[PDB]
Amino acid sequence: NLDIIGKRIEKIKQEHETSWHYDQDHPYKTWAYHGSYETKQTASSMVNGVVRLLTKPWDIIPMVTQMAMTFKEKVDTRTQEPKEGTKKLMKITAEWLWKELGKKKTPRMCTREEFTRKVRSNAALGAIFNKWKSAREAVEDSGFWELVDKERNLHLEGKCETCVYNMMSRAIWYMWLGARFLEFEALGFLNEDHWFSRENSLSGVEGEGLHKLGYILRDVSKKEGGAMYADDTAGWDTRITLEDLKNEEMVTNHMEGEHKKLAEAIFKLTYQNKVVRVQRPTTVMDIISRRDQRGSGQVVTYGLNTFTNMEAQLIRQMEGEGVFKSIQHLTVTEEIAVKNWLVRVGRERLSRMAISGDDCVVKPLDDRFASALTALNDMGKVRKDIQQWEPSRGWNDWTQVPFCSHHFHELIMKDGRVLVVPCRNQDELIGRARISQGAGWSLRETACLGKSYAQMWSLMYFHRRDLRLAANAICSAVPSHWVPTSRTTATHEWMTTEDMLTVWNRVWIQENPWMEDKTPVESWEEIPYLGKREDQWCGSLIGLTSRATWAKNIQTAINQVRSLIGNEEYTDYMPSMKRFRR
Ligand SMILES: O=S(=O)(c1ccc(F)cc1)N1CCNCC1
Ligand SMILES: O=S(=O)(c1ccc(F)cc1)N1CCNCC1
Ligand SMILES: [Zn+2]
Ligand SMILES: [Zn+2]
Numbered sequence: 001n002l003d004i005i006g007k008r009i010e011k012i013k014q015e016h017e018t019s020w021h022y023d024q025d026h027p028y029k030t031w032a033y034h035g036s037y038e039t040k041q042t043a044s045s046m047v048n049g050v051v052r053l054l055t056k057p058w059d060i061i062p063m064v065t066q067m068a069m070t071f072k073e074k075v076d077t078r079t080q081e082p083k084e085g086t087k088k089l090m091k092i093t094a095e096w097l098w099k100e101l102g103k104k105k106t107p108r109m110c111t112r113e114e115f116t117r118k119v120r121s122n123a124a125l126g127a128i129f130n131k132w133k134s135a136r137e138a139v140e141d142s143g144f145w146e147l148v149d150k151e152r153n154l155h156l157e158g159k160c161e162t163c164v165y166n167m168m169s170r171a172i173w174y175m176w177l178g179a180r181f182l183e184f185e186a187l188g189f190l191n192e193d194h195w196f197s198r199e200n201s202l203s204g205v206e207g208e209g210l211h212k213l214g215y216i217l218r219d220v221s222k223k224e225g226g227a228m229y230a231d232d233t234a235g236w237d238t239r240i241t242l243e244d245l246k247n248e249e250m251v252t253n254h255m256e257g258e259h260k261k262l263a264e265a266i267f268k269l270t271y272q273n274k275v276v277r278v279q280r281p282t283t284v285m286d287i288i289s290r291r292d293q294r295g296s297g298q299v300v301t302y303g304l305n306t307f308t309n310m311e312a313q314l315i316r317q318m319e320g321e322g323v324f325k326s327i328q329h330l331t332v333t334e335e336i337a338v339k340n341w342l343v344r345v346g347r348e349r350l351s352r353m354a355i356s357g358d359d360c361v362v363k364p365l366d367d368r369f370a371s372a373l374t375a376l377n378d379m380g381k382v383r384k385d386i387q388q389w390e391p392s393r394g395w396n397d398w399t400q401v402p403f404c405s406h407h408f409h410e411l412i413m414k415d416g417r418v419l420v421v422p423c424r425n426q427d428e429l430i431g432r433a434r435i436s437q438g439a440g441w442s443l444r445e446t447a448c449l450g451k452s453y454a455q456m457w458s459l460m461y462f463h464r465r466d467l468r469l470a471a472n473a474i475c476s477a478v479p480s481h482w483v484p485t486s487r488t489t490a491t492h493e494w495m496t497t498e499d500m501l502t503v504w505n506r507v508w509i510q511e512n513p514w515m516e517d518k519t520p521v522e523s524w525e526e527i528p529y530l531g532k533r534e535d536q537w538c539g540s541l542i543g544l545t546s547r548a549t550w551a552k553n554i555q556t557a558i559n560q561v562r563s564l565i566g567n568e569e570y571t572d573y574m575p576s577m578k579r580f581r582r
């Protein structure tokens with residue numbers, strides 16, 4: 001307790017001595033409270049005018065238009081201690097999983113140089129603004145690195161002064177760039193060296209890309225066994241227990257030297273003990289603490305979420321297969337049974353899953369899995385939108401399974417070759433491309449963000465009639481040599497000035513390990529669409545008067561945007577489509 005967090009709290013007391021008061025009207029039940037102090041400030045969603053002017057029919061569709069307008073009583077909840085049998089299952093499974101993930105990888109520190117390069121190429125590291133303006137400036141100043149040095153030596157000494165979270169079904173915990181560096185140095189290897197790639201982790205999909213996820217689900221579907229289960233957890237980050245954080249920390253058992261001590265300090269001082277500052281309109285700043293829940297950088301959060309989800313789903317599979325009888329207590333001979341199951345079939349059982357952080361798909365050995373709920377509920381991983389003891393409903397068809405906000409279609413090219421393509425309701429795709437975040441967007445920056453969405457649509461969603469047409473219109477409306485841009489950055493093959501047909505051939509044909517025939521496609525007309533009725537099912541406006549007038553008159557829309565941007569060099573991409581080809 002206060003011997004680990006006191007110094008951080010002490011240091012905050014003194015910067016705001018003209019305001020410190022142990023307020024009595026504090027709304028916290030499950031967070032430990034320490035004091036308040038004075039502040040006064042808050043970034044809404046802004047519309048992308050280039051995308052909106054080229055998607056006119058969607059101006060009257062409320063599912064699109066409402067997306068641009070506008071639970072912290074789940075952060076202030078508590079999870080119960082799991083039983084002794086559950087704690088043993090989790091410790092055995094976690095020990096085994098770190099060894100498997102570690103067989104072909106070597107833990108190592110990430111460098112000032114790798115961090116400095118990350119900040120100089122826009123990664124959403126979740127930092128705060130203020131002794132330097134941006135991240136870019138702090139990194140190019142030896143004063144910053146001396147602050148980092150001070151904290152680093154405090155961490156080696158087993159102590160923390162400045163590693164404090166700032167809070168803001170979401171809750172993002174920003175830290176100062178220095179605390180983020182020390183997290184990246186100790187634990188960045190999990191992401192930088194691809195510990196959760198499918199090759200290394202068997203269940204993971206880190207680095208795979210949206211063009212591979214449907215092929216991966218089809219490969220899981222080919223296994224003998226029961227239905228495909230895709231249960232969502234209610235508020236995963238709030239259900240991470242102190243027992244979960246202690247099993248995650250066992251990665252440090254595979255480290256040595258400085259790295260070992262630096263990583264044990266991140267886990268002990270910042271993950272298993274946290275200090276947070278939160279805005280309350282009653283506008284003041286509260287300083288609260290707690291031992292559990294997930295509060296890390298979003299990239300470390302992703303890898304540890306994937307680890308703990310892999311662990312939880314293997315235990316759920318053991319429960320369905322009858323490996324242990326009760327969570328109350330694991331007997332001596334059940335321990336050996338569990339260890340033996342892991343050694344004998346653990347790798348096969350991992351290959352039956354696709355896991356992306358808190359998101360999973362599992363094809364278990366049979367449907368006993370559906371009603372195997374005691375360990376899952378006792379670990380605190382309570383399913384969303386189902387009663388606690390109601391058996392899971394599974395999917396009989398891999399093309400209907402939800403994963404990473406998508407479903408997947410099997411699409412047959414006129415030449416017989418098979419594409420497995422990503423899809424989601426088209427209102428969600430158009431509504432997201434019409435939105436930007438942040439201030440000071442030039443017209444050029446806005447256009448280049450529109451081009452990023454358009455090239456993503458050409459590569460991932462070419463099979464949706466409306467998106468292939470809107471993508472061609474946006475690419476025709478933005479100067480041809482202008483480079484697609486994003487403020488926040490799966491693999492991003494659409495972020496390029498290369499010809500999109502060349503990129504499509506590389507991704508879907510040349511580098512696609514599920515495509516045996518490597519014959520290149522010569523034109524967009526060779527690339528198929530969903531059936532017309534399936535396109536409509538997934539939100540297409542084909543067959544509406546609004547959509548027909550938009551498609552017929554698209555050159556007028558393209559010319560409106562060109563007139564706003566001005567006299568630049570443009571390409572007409574519309575004749576790549578049969579209907580505009582004369
Ligand atoms: O509007 S931009 O995309 C742009 C790109 C290249 C230029 F030479 C000029 C402008 N944008 C500028 C501000 N932030 C980075 C990206
Ligand atoms: O066959 S349909 O699904 C269809 C959908 C989109 C089209 F552009 C053309 C046909 N249709 C048949 C008539 N009743 C409505 C549904
Ligand atoms: Zn610290
Ligand atoms: Zn679909």
